[PDB]
């Protein structure tokens, strides 16, 4: 309740502190905390701003393969990010693209990262319903691999250039 509003930054800090060592067995606990918050933030951006970057730090900590529950839970992390995005100026400009880019780094190496980027990109249009370095990278990553079947990554990166 109210203690949830006072501990939402503490929950984001707990996820940030324990989500870097998910590669070495709390990797399923990160997906449990994202899934328990999926309906949790659906009944409740200062708390969303730290949590949108904690998962990017997790995706950056062991990004060479992005240690089994931290990899296949990416479509859970992006859907929970959309559920926190549709149910949500200084801490939000540059950091808002790094999570989608940490997803998109292995979208054709695989396409679950592209489904993550597509499901996170429409949450931006829904949040804007109620882009300096982000657009050209998605346009290039859609142009160089439009025939990689990568039509999923095509629809994921064409909806990031608008």
| Helix share, percent | 55-70%
DSSP summary, beta strand count: 0
Q: How much strand content do the residues show?
A: under 5%
Task: Specify the biggest β-sheet.
Answer: none
Q: Calculate Rg over CA atoms.
A: 15 Å
What is the overall silhouette? globular
SSE class = mainly alpha
Q: Would you list the SSEs in sequence order as H and E? A: HHHHHHHH
The total count of helices amounts to 8
Termini separation (Å)? Answer: 38 Å
PDB class: membrane protein/isomerase
Keywords: cryo-EM, membrane protein, MEMBRANE PROTEIN-ISOMERASE complex
Entry title: Structure of RyR2 (*F/A/C/L-Ca2+ dataset)
Name: RyR2
General description of the model:
By secondary structure, this protein is an all-alpha fold. It is built from eight helices and no strands. α1 runs parallel beside α3 (46-61), α4 (74-86) runs parallel beside α6 (112-129) and α7 (134-143) runs antiparallel to α8. The longest helix has 18 residues, at 112-129. The chain is globular.
